[PDB]
């Protein structure tokens, strides 16, 4: 660890890239599924012709 202390920039950029990917996954899910702002409920009656 004391030897690796001089590669802090390399580790910081690695963790930054991975954190960006991780946030991007949640963003992708939000764009795909969270388009509708209201949670509509199915009607009790299913008279859909």
């Amino acid at each position: 660890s004391n030897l690796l202390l001089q590669y802090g920039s390399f580790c910081t950029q690695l963790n930054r890239a991975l954190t960006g990917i991780a946030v991007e996954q949640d963003k992708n899910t939000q764009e795909v599924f969270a388009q509708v702002k209201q949670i509509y409920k199915t009607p009790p009656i299913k008279d859909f012709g």
Binding site: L5, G8, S9, T12, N15
Partner: protein
């Protein structure tokens, strides 16, 4: 016997192997430090540099 005490106090602490994140101001003097491995917040500050 026959003597009186002074009016001075002292404090002793013990150094340990620790990782620190020091800050140098424009004039070259160390103005602040973060103790890596103190608490989770300091750990985050020390991970993100």
């Amino acid at each position: 016997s026959g003597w009186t005490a002074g009016a001075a106090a002292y404090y002793v602490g013990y150094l340990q192997p620790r990782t620190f994140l020091l800050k140098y101001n424009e004039n070259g003097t160390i103005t602040d430090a973060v103790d890596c491995a103190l608490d989770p917040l300091s750990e985050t500050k020390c991970t993100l540099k």
